[PDB]
Structure formats: C-alpha cells, structure tokens
Ligand binder design. Sequence first.
Ligand code: HEC
Ligand code: HEC
Ligand code: HEC
Ligand code: HEC
Ligand SMILES: C/C=C(C)/C=C/C=C/[C@H](OC)[C@@H](C)[C@@H](OC)[C@@H](C)CCc1oc2c(O)c(OC)cc(OC)c2c(=O)c1C
Ligand SMILES: C/C=C(C)/C=C/C=C/[C@H](OC)[C@@H](C)[C@@H](OC)[C@@H](C)CCc1oc2c(O)c(OC)cc(OC)c2c(=O)c1C
Ligand SMILES: COC1=C(OC)C(=O)C(C/C=C(\C)CCC=C(C)C)=C(C)C1=O
Ligand SMILES: COC1=C(OC)C(=O)C(C/C=C(\C)CCC=C(C)C)=C(C)C1=O
Ligand code: FES
Lengths: 60, 49, 49, 89, 48, 53, 378, 378, 75
Amino acid sequence: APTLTARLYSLLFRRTSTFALTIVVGALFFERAFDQGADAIYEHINEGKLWKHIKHKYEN
Amino acid sequence: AAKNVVSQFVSSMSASADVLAMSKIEIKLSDIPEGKNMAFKWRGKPLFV
Amino acid sequence: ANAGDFGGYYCPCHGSHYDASGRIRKGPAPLNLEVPSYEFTSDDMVIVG
Amino acid sequence: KNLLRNALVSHLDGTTPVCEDIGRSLLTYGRRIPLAEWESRIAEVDARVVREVCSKYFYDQCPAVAGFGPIEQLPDYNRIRSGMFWLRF
Amino acid sequence: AEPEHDHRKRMGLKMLLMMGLLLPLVYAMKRHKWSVLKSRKLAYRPPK
Amino acid sequence: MLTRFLGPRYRQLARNWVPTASLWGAVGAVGLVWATDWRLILDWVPYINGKFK
Amino acid sequence: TNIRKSHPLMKIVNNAFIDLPAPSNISSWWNFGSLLGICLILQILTGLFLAMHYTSDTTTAFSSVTHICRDVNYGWIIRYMHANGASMFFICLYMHVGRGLYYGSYTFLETWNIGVILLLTVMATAFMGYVLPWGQMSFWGATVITNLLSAIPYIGTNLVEWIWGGFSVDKATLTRFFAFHFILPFIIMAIAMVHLLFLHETGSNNPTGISSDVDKIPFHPYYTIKDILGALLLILALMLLVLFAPDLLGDPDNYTPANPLNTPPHIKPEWYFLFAYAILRSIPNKLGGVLALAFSILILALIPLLHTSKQRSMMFRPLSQCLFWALVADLLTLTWIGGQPVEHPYITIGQLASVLYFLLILVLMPTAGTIENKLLKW
Amino acid sequence: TNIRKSHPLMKIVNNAFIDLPAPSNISSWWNFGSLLGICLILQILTGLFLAMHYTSDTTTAFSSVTHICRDVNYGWIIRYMHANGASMFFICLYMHVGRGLYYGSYTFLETWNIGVILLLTVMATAFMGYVLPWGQMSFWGATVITNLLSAIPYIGTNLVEWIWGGFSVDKATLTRFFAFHFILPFIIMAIAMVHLLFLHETGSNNPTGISSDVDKIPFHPYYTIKDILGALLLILALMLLVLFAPDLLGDPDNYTPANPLNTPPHIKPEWYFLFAYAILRSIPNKLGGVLALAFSILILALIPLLHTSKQRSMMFRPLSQCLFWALVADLLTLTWIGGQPVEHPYITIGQLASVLYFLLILVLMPTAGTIENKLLKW
Amino acid sequence: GRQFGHLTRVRHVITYSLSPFEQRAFPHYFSKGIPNVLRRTRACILRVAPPFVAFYLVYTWGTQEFEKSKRKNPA
Ligand code: HEC
Ligand code: HEC
Ligand code: HEC
Ligand code: HEC
Ligand SMILES: C/C=C(C)/C=C/C=C/[C@H](OC)[C@@H](C)[C@@H](OC)[C@@H](C)CCc1oc2c(O)c(OC)cc(OC)c2c(=O)c1C
Ligand SMILES: C/C=C(C)/C=C/C=C/[C@H](OC)[C@@H](C)[C@@H](OC)[C@@H](C)CCc1oc2c(O)c(OC)cc(OC)c2c(=O)c1C
Ligand SMILES: COC1=C(OC)C(=O)C(C/C=C(\C)CCC=C(C)C)=C(C)C1=O
Ligand SMILES: COC1=C(OC)C(=O)C(C/C=C(\C)CCC=C(C)C)=C(C)C1=O
Ligand code: FES
C-alpha cells in the first residue's frame, strides 16, 4: 500500500481508458526523450564528421 | 515504432526532393497588345499577364 | 480569357464568373484569383516570384 | 434490496433458524444484529454502492475456479481472468 | 552510391535500442500468459 | 422516432458511462495530436518542443 | 454422401451456386447481380491485358494506349471492351440499385450497406482508370475530383497535395493512379464476396416483398440457365458498343493529349457521373456543393431509416410507384443537365431537379408510405 | 450468446484466430506459418509503395528505381525492406517446408499439396520482381528462366517467344512482367486462405506426431502472443539487413543497367535459387537438366507416397533424424556449389550432391523408416 | 446458411409437375403471350410513363428556350 506499482495500478492501470490515456501520454514523452538521447549518442560517436559540426566553417 | 514506419510510408506519397522550390519567370510587357490575356507557364500552373 | 458575364474570365468547369480584376462574381468559387508577388524592373519587363 | 428483506425475514421463521441465528451471530459478530439494523444496512445500498462494492471485489481480480465433469469447453484460465475486466471501461 | 548511408545507421541504432527494450518486454508478456500452462500440474485418478 | 430509450434507467446508464466516454475522447485527442505532430497544441506543452526557441 | 456436399471447397460452391434455395419468383431485375460479377471479371481480364502494354509515365502514356490500338494484335477490342465494359458496369450498377430501392431490398442492412461501399469503390476505380490514357479529360478529371478534398477545412489543401505528389497533377500523380487503379478491383472483388456472404444469411428478396420459403427452387438448373441468358444479353449490349459504336459513350476530347495550360470549353464527365456533377454545380458554394455530392450517393444509407410502409416492396404501392418513377426521370433529367453548359434555362431547372432528388427520398416517398398505410387501414 | 461467435464475418476470425483448438505443444518451428503471412503483407505493402513510383519501360526502369532510392522521401527503406523481405520470405519458406518434412505434416495431403503450389508461385513471383529494376542480373535472369520452356519439345520455342513478346527479351517483356508481378501476390494470398481452410479441417500437427485432442489450448491468448514475439524477431532479422547490410544478400551486378550484348563473367542466382541452379547445371543435357530442376521441387508431392514409418514425426526416429540432417547439409552444399564457377572440384561434388538429394528422398529415407519399423518389432 | 428441409412448415399442398421432355418450351407463345404484355403494360403505364413525359416536356422546352435566348433582335 506504500508501494509504487500499487499506486501506479490504483490511479492509472485499473481502468482501461486511464490505461490507454497513460500509454498515449507516455508515448508522447517517450518519443521526445528517446529521439533526444539516440541522436545525442549518434552525434557523440561521430564527433566532428557531420554537416551539423562542419556548419560554422561557412558563414552566416 | 508504429508512428515511425507509418509516417515514413505516408511521407513517400508527398512531394519528393525531385520537385521542391521553383523559380521566377521573366516576361516582356510590350509583347502583348492593349486588351489581351497571354498564357505563360510558371511553377507548373498557368500565369496570366 | 474574354468569356462570361463580367468581361474578364469564365471557368467552364462549374460556371465560375470572374471580372478583369480576377474577382469572383458568380458561380461556386470561394475566393478571388491568386495575386502573386511581383515587381516591375523599370517599365519594359515584369519579374514574378 | 427487496429480495434480501424477503429472504432475511422468510429465513427467520421457526424456532430452529432463529436459534441458529442467535448461536451463529454471537460467535461471528459478538452480538445479535436485530432485524431493524439489517433493514437500515439494506436501505443504504443504492446503485453507486453496488458499483463501488462490486468493483472492489470483482473488477480485475483473480478468481478461484473449480471444474468437475465434461469440462473440455471450460474456458482457459487466462480467458476467465480476461473476463474479470472490460476493455471498454 | 548510397546517400541514405548516415540516415540508415541512425535508424539502426534506434532499431537496436528499441529492440533491446521490446524483445525482453514482449518475452515477459508471452511468458506471463504461458505461466498458467508451464507450471500446471497433472494428476491421473482412475477408479477402483 | 427513438422513444424506446427515454426514461430514468437510461438516464442513469448514460450518467454511468459519461466519465468513460470523456476519458476515451481524452485518449483520442492526445492520440491524434501525437500522430500528426499537431503544431497548434504541442507549442503549449512545456517540454515537447522540436522547433527551437 | 455427396462429393459436392462435403468437400471443404466445393461446399462453398454448392451452398452459393447449386443447392442454394432461391425464390421461384425473381424476375429479370435480379439478373444484374451476376451481370455485375461478369462486368467485374471482364474489366479484370481486359484490364490485365491492357496493363501488359501500358506505361504510366506522362511522356509515353498516351503513346502506349495508341500503341495498343494500332500495333498490338487485337489491342483495339481489348481497349474498347474495357472502355465499354466500364460503362456496362455502370448501367448494371444503376439497374441493381434501383431494383433494390423499388423492391425494399435495402431492409437487408449489411448487404445494402456493403453495396453502398461497392458503388463508391467502383466510382473511384473508374475515375482513376479514365486518368490513365492521359488525354485532356484525363488531366482535368484528375484535377477536379482530387480537389474535392480541398473542401475539408484546415487540412484539405495538404490532403490534395498529398495525393497529387506535389503542388500540381504531374509525373507522380499518374504512376500512383496506375497502381491504385490496378489493386482496387481486387479489393472490390473481396468486398463482393462479403456482400454475397451477408446475402446468403437471408437468401434473396422477390418482386412481392413477401417471404418465399413456402416456394423455394434450387439455384441450379433454373438460375444458372437464366444467368447464362442474361450474360449473353450483356455480351450483345457490350459487343454492339465496341464493334458498331466504340466511342458513343466516351469523349472525343480525350483523344487530344493532356495540356495543363488549357481546360477545353465543353468539358463534361463520362455519362455515368453527370447527375452528381449536375447536383454539385447547382450550388454556388464550394463546401455546400461537395457536401451535396457526397450526400447524393451517401443518402442510400439513410433509405432503410425512412421506410414508413407496412409492405416491403413497391409492387402493391401505386403512390410509391409514381414517386419512384419521378425519381428515375429526375435522375434522367440531372444527367441531361450535367451534359449542358451553365447557362439560362439549365441553371434553374437543374437546381429544381437537385432539390427534387433530395425532397423525393427524404420527405415525399416516406409520406407516400404513411398515406398508403392509412389507406389500407394500417 | 456472443457477438464474436455468431456474427457471419467475426465467426471466420474467431474459428481461425481466437477459439481455434491448437496443440499445447507446438514449438518455434510452428512460428513460420504466421511469419509467411507477415512476409506476404510486408511485400504487398512495400511493393504497393514501390509501384507508386516505378515505371516499366526499358529506357526509364533503372532510373525510376534509383529515383526511389535518392529522391523519394524514405524510398530507400521501402526499396530495401522489399528486397530483404523477399529473402526473408525465402528463409521462412525453407524453415516451413523443413518443419513439415521433419514432423510428417505432409500427411495433410491437401494442405501440403497447396503448400507446394505456394512455393512454386512465390518462386515465379520473385523471379519476375528481380527482372523489374532492369539491371544485368534482371536481363539474363529473364533470359535463362523464360528459356526453360524451350526444353518442351515441338512447342517450347513458340512458348518462350509467346511470353517474351517477340524474338528477344525487350520492351514487351518488362511491361508484362510488372503486370504479372503485381497480381500474383494477391493470387498467392487467395491460395494462402485455401491452404488455411484445408488445415483447419484437421488442426495442427505437433512435435511428437501424436494426436493432441487430449490437450488442446485456445489460440488466443497463447499463440497470439507467441506469434507477436516471433514477428518481432522477424522484424529484427529484417531490420538488421536493411539498416546495417542492405546489399549482403543481393548482387552488385544488378547495379549496372541491362546490356543484351554482354552476360557478366560471375553470374549467379539470388542465394535462394542456388541449390536448384546447382542441380540443373550438374547435368550436361538440356532436357535432363530442366527435368531435374522441375523434379527438385515437384519431388515434395511424392514425399507422402514414400512415408514407410509407423510413426508420423521424426522425433522418435534417430536414423531418419540423421538422414534429414544429411538432406539439409546436402542442400547447404548445393547452394555453396551454385555460388562457385563450373570448374574442376566443383563439377563432380555438385554432381554427387545432386545424386544424394534425389537418393536421400527417394531411396534412403524410406528405407530408414522400414529399418526403424523392424527395430521396434513393427 | 439456409437449406431445403429446414426452410419453413407447409401442410396440405399438392404440386403436379411435368417433365421438360413431355412439354413445349413455347406452349402458346404468341396466342397467349401478346395478350399478357398488353395487360402488363395497361397495369403499369399510369405509374411509369407520366414522369418521363414530364422529363420530355422540360427537355423540349429547355432546349428551345436556350436556343432562342442566344439570339437578339432590336439593339
Ligand atoms: C447500394 C446497393 C448495392 C450495390 C451498389 C450493389 N449491390 Fe449487390 N445487392 C444489393 C442488395 C440489397 C441485394 C439483395 C437483392 C435482393 O435480394 O432483392 C444485392 C444482391 C446482389 C446479388 C445476388 C442477387 C441479385 O440481386 O442478383 C449479387 C450477385 C450482387 N448483389 C453482387 C453485386 C456486385 C458484384 C456489385 C458491384 C460491385 C453490387 N452487387 C453492387 C445491394 C447492392
Ligand atoms: C490489371 C489492371 C486493371 C484492372 C483490374 C482494371 N483496369 Fe481499367 N484500366 C487499366 C489500364 C492500364 C487502363 C489504361 C488503358 C486504357 O485507357 O484503356 C485502364 C483504363 C480504364 C478506363 C479508361 C477507358 C478509356 O480508355 O477511356 C476506365 C474507365 C477503367 N479502366 C475502368 C475500370 C474498371 C471499372 C475496372 C473494374 C473495377 C477496371 N478498369 C479494371 C488497368 C486496369
Ligand atoms: C510445400 C509445403 C508448404 C509450403 C511451401 C507452405 N506451407 Fe503452410 N503449411 C504446410 C503444412 C503441411 C502445414 C501444416 C503444419 C503442421 O500442422 O505441422 C502448414 C501450416 C501453415 C500455417 C499454420 C501452422 C503453422 O505451421 O504455422 C500457416 C499459417 C501457413 N501454413 C501458411 C503458409 C504460407 C503463408 C505459405 C507461403 C505462401 C506457406 N504456408 C507455404 C505446408 C506448406
Ligand atoms: C503492388 C506491386 C508489388 C507487389 C504486391 C510485390 N512487389 Fe515485388 N516489386 C514491385 C516493384 C515495382 C519492384 C521494382 C522495384 C525494386 O526493384 O525494388 C519490385 C521488386 C521486387 C524484387 C527485386 C528487389 C530488388 O530491388 O532487387 C523482388 C525480389 C520482389 N519484388 C519480390 C516480391 C515478392 C516475393 C512479393 C510477394 C509475393 C512481391 N515482390 C510483392 C512491385 C510489387
Ligand atoms: C486517391 C483519391 C481518390 C481516388 C479520390 C476519389 C474520389 C472519388 C469520388 O468518389 C468516389 C468521385 C469519383 C465521385 O464523387 C462522389 C464522382 C461521381 C464525381 C463526378 C465528377 O466527375 C468529373 C469528371 O469526371 C470530369 O472529367 C471529365 C471533370 C469534372 O469536373 C468538371 C467532374 C466533376 O466535377 C465531378 C463532380
Ligand atoms: C511467364 C513465365 C514464367 C513466370 C515462368 C516462370 C518459371 C519460373 C520457375 O519456376 C517457378 C523458376 C523461378 C524456378 O525454377 C523451378 C527457379 C528456382 C530457377 C532458378 C534459376 O535462377 C537463375 C537466375 O535467377 C539467374 O539470374 C541471376 C540466372 C540463371 O541462369 C544463369 C538462373 C538459373 O539458371 C536458374 C535455374
Ligand atoms: C442468392 O442470390 C444470388 C444470385 O441470384 C440472383 C446470383 O445469380 C449469384 C451469381 C453471382 C456471380 C456469378 C458473381 C460472383 C462475384 C464474384 C466477385 C466472384 C449469387 C452469388 C447470389 O448470391
Ligand atoms: C492452426 O494453425 C495456425 C497457426 O498456428 C501456428 C497460426 O499462427 C496462424 C496465423 C497466420 C497468419 C497471421 C497468416 C494469414 C495469411 C493471410 C494470407 C491473411 C493460422 C492462420 C493457423 O491456421
Ligand atoms: S473548377 Fe472552376 S467552377 Fe469549379
């Protein structure tokens, strides 16, 4: 009853509509956080290299 | 993942890199007599001077 | 060009009557014809876009 | 509600069921709960209470299931579990 | 020969990371349902 | 002519299903907004910002 | 124990085409269902043999179609069988709908509703098909009909450009229209099976609108032979058109190549779009005109909710018979107006005919059914 | 009374995908059936979106495919999903056949025989597909495989020229190959339904080859969830190939345009034709080589007549297990030889492997089954 | 899903039929056939024809009116 999976179930999972709402709201914030991360990993593993890092050489 | 393949598939039907950003056209004014509509092509769709 | 009942333009698709301003007067069409961005370079030529 | 008032009153009819009820109730409740109290408890129940109290025990809960006899067509337990909630709700 | 080269490798890293979430998760989903069968116990009780 | 479905029970049945039908609309609105990247609504959302500045 | 009756595949054939209990009773107006199937496979077969030689590029599309008609061994029959079969497909559709309307067959809700989808799908298919030879009617046909989507507020423009492939009808438009036009008849074929599946659940209606279980006959040999005769009449009607008048039902303007700078003076639809065309242009409003067009065909789905009569069929309903024929003649009026220019007498009478179309179905035919009920003390 | 159980359409879905009694029992080797369906619709969907931009003329066909890969928004994933899905289609086919061979599933005669048609149809479809981008492998692929018909005596030449459109592979060949390649997956889809219809008559076999009616479980949720997992592995295997190695399973020579004057030095089939290729060229005879090729796939239809064993499955048959794996490894040998030039060690070992393929199925596996019967005193 | 033997209940009805090879396909084809078509026509003419003449009148008038309108006289 202190436990967090319990309160997750009680507030959000018990009803299928709330379950669906928590998935769609969940999917919005996942798409941001994953694309933020996975781009930043890909960009860091290719340190210069891409036209995003070349950009500043040719002017405004 | 469903969003991504579906969007990518949706995007393939919309306007490709082959057709983007079309240019101006120069038309000489004195080449049309007073009282006539002259039918030019611009951006693929007719231009009326 | 030079068709319909306001001396300008007639679209033969569903009976749109435009005047010599390009303004819609009769028939189904909601809006006046698209005015492009243009300038005159002096008074010999017109460049459009 | 009416079916329960009729069941309760029709049950406590004869020396024997009343004696059972005195005996049993003192073991379980520690009092005899008088007929007028049950009626008060029955009367309180409305649709909101039935929806609340059924949801508490039934909705999305794991049943115990017992099957005996020609039971090939007895639904699989996962499909009995799935019958314990509604996707529309 | 291949202007897509950098884009396909970007989507590839996303594919691998997504699959590293989804493959153990769908596995758990499938195992959770197969629980009822995989732990089931049989007894045979014939007469006399 | 639809008068079959008008009375106290159907009034209660509609009242019961209202929070659910409201939440299914709330599901579908966000789902449309998410699927299309609906620019009009997502500019408000304080962390979901693909457009700079 | 019969091989015909118990084999898992032949089962399906037997319960549809052989042992199927059918009314003793059903007239020539019931021939159009099989005729639509014949039309479907005729269009599939010719369409396949046209696809073997057609190229879907703007530079070459007109050239390939005329290459078919001049160079390809018997390419001309195939091309004009296809063209006139599409018009045959529409004659049969309209007869089939009208039969359903008259005889109260729409009370089969699922069969009828699937039928409405089938009408819309075959309309969209045949629009696409006409775009393919890349004549003048092809191009502006493609322009106008795609642009109907631009009347959907906020997103309509994005949608039109989405299906076009860019800012105008172009290279991208024709290649996808070939692809869309290829697959859609097979999707139609699948929906035709679901149409038949829902039908077999009840069996057929009949001229009287009275249940006929008291007097069913086996589909074979009676309706197998009546269907063969009916198909042989369909072959006559088709082969009269391809061999004696191949271009009677088409447009001469589609024999000039597409030209994005000039829309022709005379432009009308293919004959089978003329009523709906007449309805849309009777309204001097963009949103209302297209809403009326959508409503002119989607109305068929309201017809079951508006059936007031205590009888199913129009056979014993003279007031309804009169108003049915007013509907056919009004539809004949609307296809005449569709054929004419937007000028003085034609604008008003086309507006009045549009109003009458919607007034007949919505108001006048339901009221006729009530009056007829009251006259029989019902 | 359930809506799922009695609605005429949902009935079909419920009796196939939900309430269908399936063995408690069936392993990962049973995942390939659904995976073939996933493959079928993947190829349909990508193939449709490729058809939206592809042109089937010889001048322009190579240009359209590269227009897809460079200019079309995400045209590259669609193109290589399609390419690698075709190879995925073959991995799943071979697993699916081998499962059937091992577990004695061929004793379902109709299901199996329809399966053999499905193999031949998907082979012919994928041959056609490879002709379409009009690379060097496309042209000579089209040349050789069409010419197999020229081995039919008296009429074979007339037949090859009949499907070509003339004396050589040409303009006419490519336009019809696009048309044939478009329709055939839908014909496949229809045959896949008849395949499933014959199967549902018995339900599934299982690893033991013993009847499992004593222990059936509902298809949902057990095999719905096992199928989802299996599909997610199929997506991994596919998306590894398109995103990390798009050209691993194809040929670099198909990136040079078709050239009727030069056949390349190195030419081999697509990996999934290599065994059958190796069989045909092991015979230094025209008629015999093509007869062996036909027989290398049509043999599967003899396998039910050659089942000697008193058990269905190979699970309790160790002699047969060994000889099954000799068959797989011999098939792996034949795809290796198919990959190599017709020179010294390769000619003989490929001839011996060809002989072993036919000897294993015809002679050695039936004899193994009899020995195994005799060893169990059966 | 409907089969003979399961359709409906019928009692006390006798049906006499003849073989196709015992009887004519066109029994009295013109002698009885013509009187029938005329009878069927009479039955329905008042229901079918008057909307189509009403089309015909609006057709004839409309074509005539359009023709006359694109002529002038005193101007
Ligand atoms: C919008 C209505 C509608 C359309 C369009 C329609 N159907 Fe039907 N169809 C029906 C109805 C209703 C029936 C039942 C008729 C009855 O029993 O009197 C039916 C009956 C039929 C029949 C068998 C009995 C008969 O009337 O001949 C076939 C076959 C048929 N449909 C196939 C088709 C095909 C093929 C198409 C074209 C793709 C199609 N239908 C278009 C509504 C329609
Ligand atoms: C296998 C592909 C294929 C199928 C199936 C198909 N067609 Fe076509 N159709 C074509 C091609 C290619 C053309 C272009 C040649 C031509 O204009 O005749 C075409 C042309 C047409 C035309 C224009 C006729 C003309 O020349 O003026 C119409 C209308 C048409 N199709 C309607 C239909 C209808 C209705 C169906 C059945 C629902 C159908 N087609 C089935 C490929 C197909
Ligand atoms: C030459 C043999 C063969 C080929 C090729 C084949 N099938 Fe099958 N298929 C079978 C047999 C036999 C079974 C029954 C397996 C069993 O019960 O053990 C079957 C079972 C299946 C199943 C369901 C059970 C399972 O094994 O997963 C599906 C679904 C399937 N087939 C679809 C397909 C599709 C789709 C194709 C590709 C068009 C195809 N099959 C190709 C012979 C084959
Ligand atoms: C709606 C039409 C369509 C369908 C359905 C289709 N494809 Fe294709 N396929 C194409 C086109 C167009 C191409 C040419 C583009 C290309 O080469 O990738 C093609 C290309 C191919 C190629 C050559 C791949 C390459 O580029 O090297 C193969 C192999 C193939 N298809 C096999 C299949 C198989 C297997 C199926 C499913 C039975 C199938 N296709 C379904 C239209 C289709
Ligand atoms: C990918 C997107 C797709 C396939 C969208 C498809 C939409 C399809 C429609 O619904 C099915 C449609 C065919 C249907 O409308 C209900 C018709 C009866 C429309 C009739 C129609 O024809 C015209 C035509 O043929 C022309 O050329 C000769 C030119 C035209 O203007 C001058 C028209 C026209 O003004 C109308 C209303
Ligand atoms: C309209 C007529 C049609 C559709 C006729 C279709 C016939 C289809 C066949 O049966 C289905 C066929 C595909 C099937 O044979 C059993 C294959 C496994 C054949 C394997 C195959 O591939 C080759 C190939 O790919 C090549 O190019 C790279 C070139 C080749 O030579 C050098 C071959 C080749 O020598 C063989 C035997
Ligand atoms: C119960 O009424 C029925 C009829 O009596 C009027 C028919 O004549 C036909 C014959 C229909 C054919 C040949 C078209 C088949 C369509 C496809 C797509 C294969 C059917 C199915 C039917 O159900
Ligand atoms: C009794 O065994 C069965 C399975 O158990 C191994 C399946 O998994 C599937 C699932 C198959 C699918 C999704 C492919 C459908 C194909 C088409 C063309 C729509 C079927 C039908 C089946 O019968
Ligand atoms: S397109 Fe001009 S009037 Fe409709």
